[PDB]
Amino acid sequence: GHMIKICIAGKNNIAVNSLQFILKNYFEADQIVVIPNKNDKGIDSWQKSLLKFALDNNIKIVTLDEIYNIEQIIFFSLEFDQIIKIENFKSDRLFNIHFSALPKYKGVFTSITPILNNELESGVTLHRIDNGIDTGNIIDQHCFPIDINDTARDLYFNYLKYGESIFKKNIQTIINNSYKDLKQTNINSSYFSRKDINLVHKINFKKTSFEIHNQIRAFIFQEYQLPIINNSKIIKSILANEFIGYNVFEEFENYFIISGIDGFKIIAQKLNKL
């Protein structure tokens, strides 16, 4: 049966680089379809455009409706924006790479939520798609550090890097259908929705230096927003082990020096610094 073997649905460098990899190594253009996200305008910007790549390489753009009845298609979500209902699909080869160490941080804004909840590590997880949000059985996972001064943007670029890597690592077993999976546990499972995160974050300074630093850097992702302290945008936060006294807060031309209830030095750099 069908001409079409695989759909890449989603966006950004992970979708494009994964598509490029399958086109290189596994499938021809006329065996592939893509479903870009709704906001993809076909322009390479701070991320590559999946729509652009498809148009440039002669790969058909489709809707979900067009692929539901396609027997045995591999459906791969790589930052895809639409919740699927699995019973729509004839095929049960439905996979996602989620940007967290599941079962933690299901849902959205995963470059923000682990930092804001004081994690020292995150991960990428390849899993089956079921009808819930990031709830399906885990196939592989790679965990990696959130370095102490990483911003949400830095973490997102690590997700793209390690996510592309885990795709390449696992795709052969998906294609031959010999992969193994395990149910997610109930314990440690967590979830955040768009509503749970106010993107204009008001910092609670009656917190430890680690928590104040995490509140700042979790919102540093300049293409979307920067945290504002005393009507200044912040581009970087640096947390030191140096004790400087409790509850320090001082504004300078290029930065703030801050400490919380445990007195460790934070330098919050203003965007205006040359």
Ligand X SMILES: Nc1nc(=O)c2c([nH]1)NC[C@@H](CNc1ccc(C(=O)N[C@@H](CCC(=O)O)C(=O)O)cc1)N2C=O
Ligand Y SMILES: Cc1cn([C@H]2C[C@H](O)[C@@H](COP(=O)(O)OP(=O)(O)O[C@H]3O[C@H](C)[C@H](O)[C@H](NC=O)[C@H]3O)O2)c(=O)[nH]c1=O
Q: Which residues would be at the binding site for a second copy (CB under 8 A)?
A: 103, 106-107, 117-118, 120, 131-133, 135, 148, 184-191, 193, 195-196, 204, 206-211, 239-241, 246, 260-264
Beta strands in the chain (DSSP E): 6-10, 32-36, 60-61, 74-78, 93-98, 106-107, 121-128, 138-145, 191-192, 228-229, 232-243, 249-251, 255-258, 264-270
Q: Residues 210, 264: contact at Cβ < 8 Å?
A: yes
Answer yes or no whether residue 211 interacts with ligand X by CB under 6 A: no
Distance CA 143, CA 125 (A): 8
In the complex, least distance from residue 95 CB atom to a second copy, rounded to whole angstroms: 18
β-sheet bridge partners, residue 191:
106
- Contact stretch for ligand Y (CB under 6 A) within 18-26, 73-81, 243-251, 261-269: 73-81
d(CA 121, CA 213): 16
Strands (DSSP E) found in 29-107: 32-36, 60-61, 74-78, 93-98, 106-107
Q: Between 221 and 260, how does the x/- string for binding to ligand Y read (CB under 6 A)?
A: x--xx-----------------------------------
Using CB under 5 A, which of 137, 177, 185, 193 touches Cl ion? 137
Contact call for residues 124 and 97 (beta carbons, < 8 A) = yes
| Closer of 37 and 118 to a second copy (Cβ) | 118
CA count, 13 A, side-chain hemisphere, 13? 13
Q: Which residue in the block uniquely carries the two structure tokens 């049960």?
A: 92
Is residue 197 part of the contact set for ligand X (CB under 6 A)? no
Q: If DSSP codes are grouped into helix, strand and coil, which group holds residue 226?
A: coil
CB of 68 to ligand Y, least distance (A): 19
Contacts (CB under 6 A) with ligand X, residues 166-195: 193-195
- 128 sits near Cl ion (criterion: CB under 5 A): yes
Q: Does 247 sit near ligand X (CB under 6 A)?
A: no
* Minimum CB distance to ligand Y, residue 86 (Å): 15
Binding site for Cl ion (CB under 5 A): 128, 130, 136-137
Instruction: Note the residues at the interface with ligand Y (CB under 6 A).
Output: 79-81, 96, 98-99, 108-112, 134, 152, 156, 199, 221, 224-225
